């Protein structure tokens, strides 16, 4: 077809430089349509002369400079012929400039074309960001340049492959201040076009993709900061926020991380300016653009007074991920959007190391298994999950580019990176990355080049030897989704590997050459003694003597869960391991202890191991005080709680749990000096929250006393908050459940009053906890009215009401009755309608409950469920599965769980 | 008991953060103020042979934050008294002075023979906020 019809820009047009002059209107017009009108010169060389030139410009009408829309000026040797017409293909939304005259090969033609565009707040292209400060809406020009968005803002040859040096002249209102990837070449000119218009020249950027280039005109206040390396950092934030000083912590955090990254990369940051922008609302929440990084305000700014330790962790991690991106995938250009999963994965793993550098005390590396590996363990286990590798051919449309960004791409990528580092022993991996960065700087690149460099570093050093090539080991993991389960029999030493699907019965349509047989790195401990590393071949069954044990000795595998795989043991070994755990948990490493609880429960869901064995794993928790094993157990027990909350099994279950929880609660009370000396370490702080919440939920009279005292303290002098931020949520919810109407009212008043989004969110969750039926119904009615609850907030409120057990029935009825009004508002525009359907049916385990769902679906079928339609099918399937469990195994599980709980009481 | 010389007295800033069980508890980082002895603030070895050693307590309260600006209130209000099990003598800051040749108030455990122990006194419980290490004995000084 036509070259313009093709998504890809033709290679022949290569942009040497772009001079962009643009004037956004931040003043509403007579029409009221804010308009960006500017003239931009395209300085480019044609590798093959082409009469028709294709520019990626989206939805831009073209103003005519004098006689023609495009005026071309060529200076000296460079020669440019004025182009007769500008046309935009509807199918591809690309500007095509049609010139009758044949082009001159490899000559510079500068094409200055005036264009008119409309600034619309779609968070794409040239868009307007609005923030209310002191009751006044403020208009700021913003550019989203990711993928197709760059074209909308300005004509550009937009491709990761196409790289240009960008000189920007920005005409903007004088009060507002312009920003661009590069430092300003020239100061803003007050009266050059008009006194109102301020024109700021900007330096030519280092060659980069147009998507990387961004320009922002904002009213944000600035406090300039310069590093010893001379990179200028700092933040763009609203003036009241600057007075608050919330961004100061982020500024403090950025500098060491940049230096650390530079040492690992072995390359200094090319740009002398990196700007962090606190966008009031940013849908992405972070920007990967070189030089200019824009983040949502919540991610960028941390308030010491009202924000939790989890928030502090969020700020440090997000900054690190973006800083890593500047060196990786930007300096060494990413070849195409298809390689994004590698870039994101590399950045996330690197971000954890950077965060650890920033905060030495926190063991972020320990947290990685729970945060990334465990989170994608669930998604990978489902048979429907996509393979990690993404082909260049596959990614063509802008929607396809959006598809590459996904949780699996970042999280699984980080896990594979950790495994890769372990086989390469870190130093070789670091050397390979550094060499790759220097060799390929400013060149579009693929993962294979990086892999070759790591392999070369391994080749240089003979101290560490890999049986298989780095590329080969990596390929097995990247090409196919999922993880294997390795089963070892102690008596013979035999090892067996097979794919893990959480669902007992599932079909995996996707086919791989490896067929889920993977080379596995095995680290083993026998009876507390480390054994030499064994590299498992990609074969189903192998026999190794080291694994074989006799009598008392027991064997352990996957130390520290470096490998992406599940592990199983023979029943006698399982018993021995369990016995060892009761006598001493010290021999087992902490990550491994968490692994055994998590693994047994996962295996129990698939029915590989009996339900009782999973319960046996919970038995040693009485001794355990560490955060990671406890966290894994609590997450697993949530399914049990939902299924048995209304059943008779709940009473025995509560007693067993109370017994396991009490030593931990007591130990924590003793370490924290009765809850005031909150632990400094992040993992320890997280466990402090876990102990309080679990204790209150099941029995534990002491917990109730603490919650009551804390809430009473809050009610007196409500404006200042006595409660610790980490513990604020638990106290609020519990108090409302114990409390009457008066408690609910006090919280409601606070929810409306609070300016902070975070505080308002905490209050909103607490309101749902109330026991009385009438109170819950009044709350459900409040949501429909706009003044009481904002539209975005409404979906969240409904989800919390469903969570309360008394509230579940009421919420379900309200949802059926008021479906049409909600559907019009949120089914359209995809405002978490699917999430709302998912919140309901969480606790549904009975046949009668299923019947109600079917009726609602038929009744409201004509109205439609908007975005929620797919979720409705999913919710029904989940409910069916819980009842199905009762039909095959849960009826036994219900009896057994009762018996086990009774015995352990 | 005799003081050859009686001519600065330490003040223990007291940090009290409520337990949440309603029990007043002493907190870490309570600051015993040690005056500069010549060059060094942390260790004061009195030039005077004997010491007045008066104790002053300033109650400060924290909701949860490090800042101790909030004033001590109700149960949280506390006073600090120094009595030491570790030193052979009970040493409850008595006018009676026991032995000593060189008395120092090191903030460092290393190099110090015994530690004076200062305990916040609250109605619910007595909690030892800090151990003031003392390089501890001679006939010459009483
Ligand atoms: C941390 O908190 C524990 C537990 O305190 C518990 O919750 C509080 C709200 C109070 O209601 C406590 O009574 C409750 O147990 C404290 O341990 C507890 O200390 C109290 C005070 O000494 C003990 O009460 C005594 O009980 C004996 C019975 O033999 C009576 O003779 C006394 O008159 C007095 O009432 C209580 O037994 C004890 N509880 C436990 C679990 O042993 C603990 O003191 C506290 N730690 C700190 C740092 O203050
Ligand atoms: C005894 O003295 C110590 C100092 O040796 C006091 O600890 C310090 O308390 C101040 C006031 O809270 C802390 O300042 C804080 O800084 C953080 C940022 O780092 C800021 O977010 C807070 O708002 C506050 O400005 C200071 O960091 C802290 N220092 C230490 C060592 O942690 C202690 O509070 C004093 N105790 C008494 C009894 O007064
Ligand atoms: C030692 O590691 C270096 C780092 O990659 C390797 O040097 C590369 O050599 C290849 C050719 O084999 C070139 O394509 C790269 O440009 C080189 N990188 C640079 C700039 O150092 C070298 O091959 C390794 N030596 C061994 C024995 O494998
Ligand atoms: C598994 O992870 C643990 C926990 O991080 C590692 O223990 C650390 O070991 C390093 C040096 O090896 C020490 O500097 C840290 O103090 C240890 N951390 C803690 C909190 O114990 C352990 O080395 C890892 N084991 C394996 C098999 O690599
Ligand atoms: C979970 O642990 C229980 C006991 O804690 C196991 O029950 C024991 O089973 C062994 C052999 O299977 C018997 O010799 C013991 O007499 C049993 N003990 C009691 C008190 O019943 C149970 O088998 C474990 N679960 C699994 C599936 O291994
Ligand atoms: C404590 O009281 C003093 C003296 O009135 C006052 O200056 C200070 O603001 C109070 N601290 C707080 C925040 O309660």
For residue A744, count other CB atoms closer than 10 A to its CB: 22
Residue A105 sits in a domain of what CATH number?
2.60.40.1730
Experimental approach was cryo-EM
Using a 6 Å cutoff on CB, does residue A594 contact ligand 4? no
Q: Is A329 helix (H, G, I), strand (E, B) or coil?
A: strand
For residue A358, count other CB atoms closer than 10 A to its CB: 20
Which two three-digit tokens encode residue A622?
A: 């009485």
A93 found inside a domain: yes
Q: Is A42 helix (H, G, I), strand (E, B) or coil?
A: strand
Cβ-Cβ contacts under 8 Å, A709 against chain B = 20-22
Question: What backbone phi and psi angles, to 5 degrees, belong to A765?
Answer: -65, -40
A525: containing domain? 484-624
Q: Are residues A807 and A834 in the same domain?
A: yes
Beta bridge partners of B24: B18
Which two three-digit tokens encode residue A4?
A: 């313009």
- Sign for the CA dihedral angle at A429, A430, A435, A441 comes to positive
Which two three-digit tokens encode residue A732?
A: 């609020």
Q: Are residues A764 and A786 in the same domain?
A: no
Sole residue written with tokens 């922008």: A277
Of A140, A125, A157, which Cα lies nearest the Cα of A59? Answer: A125
Number of domains into which chain A is organized: 6
Task: List the end-to-end C-alpha distance of chain B, in Å, as a whole number.
Answer: 7
Residues of A known to be catalytic: 322
Q: Are residues A98 and A38 in the same domain?
A: yes
CA of A426 to the centre of ligand 4 (A): 15
- Sign for the CA dihedral angle at A291, A296, A298, A299 comes to negative
For residue B1, count other CB atoms closer than 10 A to its CB: 9
A360 found inside a domain: yes
Q: How far apart are CA A575 and CA A596, in angstroms?
A: 12
Q: Are A826 and A789 in contact (CB under 8 A)?
A: no
- Sign for the CA dihedral angle at A706, A709, A715, A720 comes to negative
Of A515, A516, A444, A508, which Cα lies nearest the Cα of A486? Answer: A516
CA of A337 to the centre of ligand 3 (A): 27
Question: What backbone phi and psi angles, to 5 degrees, belong to A32?
Answer: 95, 5
Find the helix or strand (DSSP H, E) in which A618 lies: helix A611-619
Order of strands, edge to edge, in the sheet holding A215-218?
A125-133, A136-144, A215-218, A177-180
Q: Are residues A442 and A303 in the same domain?
A: no
Residue after which a domain boundary falls, among A276, A299, A330: A330
Chain breaks in chain B (C to N over 2.5 A) after: 7, 136
Task: List the end-to-end C-alpha distance of chain A, in Å, as a whole number.
Answer: 75
State whether A725 and B28 contact (CB < 8 Å): no
State whether A710 and B17 contact (CB < 8 Å): no
Pairing between strand A13-24 and A70-73? unpaired
Order of strands, edge to edge, in the sheet holding A524-526?
A529-530, A524-526, A555-557
Q: How far apart are CA A388 and CA A417, in angstroms?
A: 13
Q: How far apart are CA A406 and CA A399, in angstroms?
A: 12
Q: Counting ligands in written order, which one lies closest to the CA of residue A619?
A: 5
Residue after which a domain boundary falls, among A307, A330, A353: A330
A86 found inside a domain: yes
- Facing B64 at nearest CB: one of A674, A705, A724: A724
Question: What backbone phi and psi angles, to 5 degrees, belong to A814?
Answer: -65, -40
CA of B70 to the centre of ligand 6 (A): 6
Find the helix or strand (DSSP H, E) in which B127 lies: strand B126-134
A552 found inside a domain: yes
Ligand 3 environment, Cβ below 6 A: A 435, 439, 453, 456-457, 459-460
Which two three-digit tokens encode residue A739?
A: 């409390």
Please give, rounded to a whole number of angstroms, the shortest distance from the CA of A675 to a CA of chain B: 6
For residue A248, count other CB atoms closer than 10 A to its CB: 16
Q: Per residue in A585-600, is it b (16+ CB within 10 Å) or e — as a string? A: bebbebbbbbbbbbbb
Q: How far apart are CA A151 and CA A211, in angstroms?
A: 8
| Nearest CA owner, ligand 5 atom 10 | A575
CA of B68 to the centre of ligand 2 (A): 8
Residue after which a domain boundary falls, among A427, A455, A479: A479
A656 found inside a domain: no
CATH topology of domain B11-134: Immunoglobulin-like (2.60.40)
Of A621, A601, A620, A597, which Cα lies nearest the Cα of A611? Answer: A601
- Compute chain B's Rg from CA coordinates: 16
CA atoms within 13 A on the CB side of A568: 24
Q: Are A742 and A775 in contact (CB under 8 A)?
A: no
For A558: left if phi > 0, alpha if psi spans -120 to 50, otherwise beta; the answer is left
Helices and strands (H and E) in chain A: how many: 31, 28
DSSP-assigned states of every residue in A822-879: HIIIIITTTSSHHHHHHHTTSS--SHHHHHHHHHHHHHTTTT--TTHHHHHHHHHHHH
Q: How far apart are CA A878 and CA A842, in angstroms?
A: 8
Q: How far apart are CA A745 and CA A758, in angstroms?
A: 19
Q: Are residues A508 and A454 in the same domain?
A: no
Q: Are residues A884 and A752 in the same domain?
A: no
Residue A901 sits in a domain of what CATH number?
1.25.50.20
Q: Are A97 and A9 in contact (CB under 8 A)?
A: no
Q: Are residues A19 and A135 in the same domain?
A: yes
Q: Are residues A342 and A287 in the same domain?
A: no
Give residues 725 to 744 of A whose Cβ lies within 8 Å of B: 725
A631 found inside a domain: no
Question: What resolution in angstrom units was achieved for this structure?
Answer: 2.9
DSSP-assigned letter for residue A89: -
For residue A402, count other CB atoms closer than 10 A to its CB: 14
Q: Are residues A60 and A181 in the same domain?
A: yes
Q: Which chain A residue's Cα is nearest to B27? A: A677
> Which contacts qualify for A324-327: CB closer than 8 Å, 24 or more apart?
A324/A261, A324/A350, A324/A351, A324/A354, A325/A288, A326/A269, A326/A271, A326/A274, A326/A290, A326/A291, A326/A293, A327/A261, A327/A262, A327/A265, A327/A267, A327/A269, A327/A437
Q: Are residues A248 and A108 in the same domain?
A: no
State whether A705 and B64 contact (CB < 8 Å): no
State whether B19 and A721 contact (CB < 8 Å): no
Q: Are A78 and A107 in contact (CB under 8 A)?
A: yes
Task: Give how far Cα A668 sits from Cα of A113, A582, A594, A696, Å.
Answer: 69, 20, 19, 14
Q: Are residues A823 and A873 in the same domain?
A: yes
Q: Are A179 and A218 in contact (CB under 8 A)?
A: yes
Q: Per residue in A515-545, is it b (16+ CB within 10 Å) or e — as a string? A: ebbbbbbbbbbbeeeebeebebebeeeeebe
State whether A709 and B20 contact (CB < 8 Å): yes
A490 found inside a domain: yes
Q: How far apart are CA A534 and CA A524, in angstroms?
A: 8
Judged by a CB distance cut-off of 8 A, whether residue B18 touches chain A is yes
Q: How far apart are CA B32 and CA B131, in angstroms?
A: 10
Q: Are residues A142 and A274 in the same domain?
A: no
A653 found inside a domain: no
Which two three-digit tokens encode residue A640?
A: 């049990």
Q: Per residue in B66-88, is it b (16+ CB within 10 Å) or e — as a string? A: eebebebeebbbbebebbbeebe
Q: Counting ligands in written order, which one lies closest to the CA of residue A450?
A: 3
């Amino acid at each position: 077809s036509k070259p313009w019809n093709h998504y890809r820009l033709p290679k022949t047009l290569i942009p040497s430089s772009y001079n962009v002059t643009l004037r956004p209107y931040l003043t509403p017009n007579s029409n009221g349509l804010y308009t960006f009108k500017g003239s931009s010169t395209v300085r480019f060389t044609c590798k093959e002369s082409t009469s028709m030139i294709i520019i990626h410009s989206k939805k831009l009408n073209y103003t005519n400079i004098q006689g023609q829309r495009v005026a071309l000026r060529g200076v000296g040797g460079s020669q440019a012929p004025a182009i007769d017409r500008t046309e935009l293909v509807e199918v591809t939304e690309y500007l095509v400039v049609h010139l009758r005259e044949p082009l001159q090969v490899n000559s510079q033609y500068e094409m200055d074309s005036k264009f008119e565009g409309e600034l619309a707040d779609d968070l794409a292209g040239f868009y307007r960001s609005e923030y209310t400060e002191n009751g006044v809406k403020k208009v700021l020009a913003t550019t989203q340049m990711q993928a197709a968005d760059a074209r909308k803002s300005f004509p550009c040859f937009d491709e990761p492959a196409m790289k240009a040096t960008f000189n920007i002249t920005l005409i903007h209102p004088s009060n507002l201040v312009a920003l661009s990837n590069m430092l300003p070449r020239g100061p803003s000119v007050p009266f050059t076009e008009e006194p109102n218009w301020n024109v700021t020249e900007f330096e030519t950027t280092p060659i980069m993709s147009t998507y990387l280039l961004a320009y922002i005109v904002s009213e944000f206040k600035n406090v300039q900061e310069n590093t010893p390396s001379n990179v200028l950092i700092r933040i763009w934030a609203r003036p009241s926020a600057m007075d608050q000083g919330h961004g100061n912590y982020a500024l403090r955090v950025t500098g060491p991380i940049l230096d650390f990254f530079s040492r690992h990369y072995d390359t200094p940051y090319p740009l002398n300016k990196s700007d962090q922008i606190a966008l009031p609302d940013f849908n992405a929440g972070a920007m990967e653009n070189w030089g200019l990084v824009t983040y949502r305000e919540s991610a960028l700014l941390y308030d010491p007074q009202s924000s939790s330790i989890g928030n502090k962790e969020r700020v440090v991690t997000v900054i690190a991920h973006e800083l890593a991106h500047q060196w990786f995938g930007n300096l060494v250009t990413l070849e195409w959007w298809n390689d994004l999963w590698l870039n994101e994965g590399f950045a996330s793993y690197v971000e954890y190391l950077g965060a650890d550098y920033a905060e030495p005390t926190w063991n972020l590396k320990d947290l990685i298994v729970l945060n990334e590996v465990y989170r994608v363990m669930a998604v990978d286990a489902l048979a429907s999950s996509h393979p990690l590798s993404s082909p260049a051919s596959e990614v063509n449309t802008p929607a396809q580019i959006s598809e590459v960004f996904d949780s699996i791409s970042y999280s699984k990528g980080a896990s594979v990176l950790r495994m890769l580092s372990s086989f390469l022993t870190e130093d070789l991996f670091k050397k390979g990355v550094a060499s790759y960065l220097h060799t390929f700087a400013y060149q579009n690149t693929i993962y294979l080049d990086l892999w070759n460099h790591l392999q070369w570093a391994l080749g240089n050093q003979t101290a560490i030897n890999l049986p298989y090539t780095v590329n080969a080991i990596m390929d097995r993991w990247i090409l196919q989704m999922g993880f294997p389960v390795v089963t070892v029999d102690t008596t013979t030493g035999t090892l067996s590997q097979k794919h893990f699907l959480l669902d007992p019965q599932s079909n995996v349509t996707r086919p791989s050459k490896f067929n889920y047989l993977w080379i596995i790195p095995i680290s083993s401990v026998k009876s507390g003694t480390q054994q030499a590393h064994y590299w498992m071949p990609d074969n189903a069954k192998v026999q190794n003597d080291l694994f074989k044990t006799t009598g008392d000795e027991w064997v352990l595998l996957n130390l520290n869960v470096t490998g992406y795989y599940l592990v199983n043991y023979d029943q006698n070994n399982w018993k021995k391991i369990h016995t060892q755990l009761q006598t001493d948990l010290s021999v087992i490493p902490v990550i491994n202890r968490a692994q055994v609880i998590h693994d047994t429960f996962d295996l129990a869901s698939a029915q590989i191991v009996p339900v009782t064995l999973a319960l046996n794993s919970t038995l040693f928790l009485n001794q355990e005080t560490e955060y990671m094993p406890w966290e894994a157990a609590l997450s697993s027990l949530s399914y049990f709680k939902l299924m048995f909350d209304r059943s008779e099994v709940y009473g025995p279950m509560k007693n067993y749990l109370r017994k396991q929880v009490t030593p931990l609660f007591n130990h924590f009370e003793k370490i924290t000096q009765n809850w005031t000396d909150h632990p400094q370490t992040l993992t320890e702080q997280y466990n402090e929250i876990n102990a309080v919440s679990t204790a209150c939920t099941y029995g534990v009279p002491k917990c109730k006393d603490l919650v009551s005292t804390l809430f009473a303290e809050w009610r007196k002098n409500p404006q200042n908050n006595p409660i610790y931020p980490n513990l604020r949520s638990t106290v609020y919810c519990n108090a409302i459940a114990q409390g009457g109407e008066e408690e609910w009212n006090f919280v409601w008043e606070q929810f409306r009053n609070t300016s902070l989004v975070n505080e308002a969110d905490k209050l909103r969750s607490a309101l749902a906890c109330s026991t009385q039926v009438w109170i819950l119904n009044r709350y459900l009615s409040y949501t429909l009215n706009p003044e009481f609850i904002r539209k975005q907030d409404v979906i969240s409120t409904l989800s919390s009401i469903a969570s309360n057990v008394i509230g579940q029935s009421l919420a379900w009825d309200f949802i059926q009755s008021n479906w049409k009004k909600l559907f019009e508002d949120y089914g359209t525009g995809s405002f978490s309608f699917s999430n709302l359907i998912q919140a309901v049916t969480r606790r549904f385990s009975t046949e009668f409950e299923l019947q109600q769902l079917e009726q609602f679906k038929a009744n409201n079928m004509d109205t439609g469920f908007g975005s929620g339609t797919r979720a409705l099918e999913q919710a029904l399937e989940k409910t069916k599965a819980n009842i199905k469990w009762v039909k095959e195994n849960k009826e036994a599980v219900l009896q057994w769980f009762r018996e086990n709980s009774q015995g352990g009481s | 008991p005799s003081f050859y010389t009686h001519t600065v007295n330490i003040t223990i800033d007291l940090g009290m953060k409520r337990s949440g069980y309603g029990q007043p508890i002493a907190s870490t980082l309570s600051n015993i103020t040690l005056p500069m002895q010549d060059n060094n603030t942390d260790v004061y070895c009195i030039r005077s042979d004997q010491f007045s050693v008066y104790v002053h307590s300033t109650c400060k309260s924290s909701l949860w934050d490090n800042i101790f600006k909030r004033n001590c209130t109700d149960v949280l209000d506390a006073t600090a008294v120094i009595k030491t099990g570790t030193c052979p003598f009970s040493f409850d800051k008595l006018n009676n002075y026991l032995t000593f040749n060189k008395f120092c108030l090191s903030l460092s455990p290393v190099g110090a023979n015994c530690k004076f122990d200062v305990a916040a006194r609250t109605r619910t419980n007595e909690q030892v906020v800090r151990s003031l290490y003392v390089i501890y004995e001679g006939d010459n000084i009483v």
